[PDB]
Write a protein that binds this ligand. Sequence first.
Ligand SMILES: [Mg+2]
Ligand SMILES: [Zn+2]
Ligand SMILES: [Zn+2]
Ligand SMILES: [Zn+2]
Lengths: 63, 263, 45, 66, 137, 113, 49
Amino acid sequence: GRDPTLNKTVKIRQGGYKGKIGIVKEANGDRFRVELHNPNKTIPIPCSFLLIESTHGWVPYED
Amino acid sequence: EPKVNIINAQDDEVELMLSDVNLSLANSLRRTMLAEVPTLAIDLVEIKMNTSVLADEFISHRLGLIPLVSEDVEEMKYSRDCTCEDYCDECSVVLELSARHEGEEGTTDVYSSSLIKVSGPGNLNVGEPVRRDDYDQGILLCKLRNHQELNIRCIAKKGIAKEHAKWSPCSAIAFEYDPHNKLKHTDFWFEVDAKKEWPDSKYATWEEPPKPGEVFDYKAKPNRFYMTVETTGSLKANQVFSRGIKTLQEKLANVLFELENSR
Amino acid sequence: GVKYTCGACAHNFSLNKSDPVRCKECGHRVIYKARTKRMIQFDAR
Amino acid sequence: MIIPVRCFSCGKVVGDKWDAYLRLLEEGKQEGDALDELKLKRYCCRRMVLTHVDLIEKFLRYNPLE
Amino acid sequence: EDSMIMNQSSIDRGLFRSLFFRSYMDQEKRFGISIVEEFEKPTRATTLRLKHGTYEKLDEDGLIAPGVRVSGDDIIIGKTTPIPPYHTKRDASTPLRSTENGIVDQVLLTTNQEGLKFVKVRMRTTKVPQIGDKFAS
Amino acid sequence: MNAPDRFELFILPDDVPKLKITPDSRVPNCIIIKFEREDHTLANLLREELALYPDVTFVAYKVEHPLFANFVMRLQTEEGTRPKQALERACASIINKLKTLDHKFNEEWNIKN
Amino acid sequence: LMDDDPVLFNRQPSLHKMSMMAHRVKVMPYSTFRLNLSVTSPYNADFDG
RNA sequence: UCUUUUAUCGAGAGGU
Ligand SMILES: [Mg+2]
Ligand SMILES: [Zn+2]
Ligand SMILES: [Zn+2]
Ligand SMILES: [Zn+2]
């Protein structure tokens, strides 16, 4: 891979998609592509807007 | 200058005659009541377990259409102006449901009254689903046969009737004006007679019938209006009306603010 | 290894890919995989 | 398949008028009077309940695969 | 010219709204006495000519589980073919169609006629009317 | 697959003014106002009211395409008055009317119960 | 593809030389093309699918 | 710094 958060499950904490589950489909740089679970669409979102799941709860981009 | 004359008033519907105003103010009031009365409704569903004979989004749809009580919904903030992460307490109401069948003979009916409010910002009057009486069971969500557990957890957020037709408070609103046809704003189809081939609108006695020796005036305008408002229990009609007028006033005040600060 | 359910006796078990295809109970020969263990959201819309 | 919740044209909730409708059909009432007693005057909410096809009755008799 | 005007609120409340299933199938062909094909997950070290979509949604025996969302070209059945005599296996997968977005519904696993494995998958999705769909009286 | 997100019918992005004004040139003392994220409700409620003051000569509006969200409005008074002030006056008047209506409705309700 | 590009526009089966005409582009949402109805006469077209 | 795979022949059911 070319990053450590691809394909990992994510929760969105800002924006119109707040509270929605997703998966990091592509994280080239700063602007990520999260594949939302709820409707069949992959959205552009800033990496600042995401919580990643880790060993203990949803951590911000410090994982 | 405006006037009001309530003809029928009760719990969840009003029938009134709105008089001595303009037209697009009453019409804009109607559209405002059908389009912008911010209410509350279920928004997210996280199904923990489903083993019934119904696909998920079918259930999540039916839950998506359930009326909840929202008297104090003009204080809770929207979902986009809370600075927390995921959700907190000043932005949603959390419900949970858990039902199972037990035995070999039987067909348990999972209703809507079995929804239990868990956590919400207090102490405000939200969350609880609308109940008709003191015994009534309400909406019929699902059915369960032998060994079919169902357990789910739902989020509930605030919205208006422009983002989805579920946050809408009123059903249908009756509206009319000028029953005897005096302004000649319309024309009537007929085969033999245009009088013995049409119904009489329930209000053709409140105004007087025109004289057959009358000429045609040409300065009058639609003046006396007749409207009737229903609800689904999520609100009560007087609150719908007052909140509508309040929202319209806030809109005009916003536009005036833009015009003033744009200087 | 992973959960598997029989077609008939409704009996759960697990496999390590080494067994042949039947339940340890009645031995019915059309087995279904079980639900997964993640979390599934929706929109209610 | 199963009774809807809202209506389709206006939105008057008709998800709690199926049990009373069946029970009033056991007592020998008529559909016109069984709807005149459930308070349904606009014929959209009337057609919503008069022409429903209840299918879940079948969908249960197939033994559970789970 | 035979077009119409449909209401949005009725579409929202559930008018003309439909479910849409689909199913896939794959089995195991035998070539040698001991040379067969095994459902599994290929890794980059051993197999060759991998396809592009993510392989991270397969469990360990090569069959994706129900409850997982699958979109464009997500690999659902990883199957390998052994190379005729390191780096000694060739990929023979089965990807989801390049124009579908669905939730996996039900997976089936049984034996064939000869005596080897035999898998089916069943995906489903929801469809709603919009500007372009056809209707008829 | 190609659907506009619904909330875009009433949530304003950052780089879009809620209101923009441009003066027309073919005739003097006439201006063009451009409203974002508004429909027939505000536009009509303003139009029927401005179309009454004995000093505004031509007022109109239109919605260009119903799939987007905006409308444009043409306003022309006479030489003495500047149109912006007149628009503000109309807003104030309408607000007053709504207030009175709410008051009398509440009185009639508390009497009728 | 952006606003005001000239694209060729065609329907099968083309007969007389009016069934292939270049229109100006205009980006719109949703999933279908758009025509002004006055150009339904050389194309022998109708919106019935 | 890219790239990145869709057999073949034949038969049938359909849409303007
Ligand atoms: Mg045609
Ligand atoms: Zn919050
Ligand atoms: Zn068994
Ligand atoms: Zn109705």
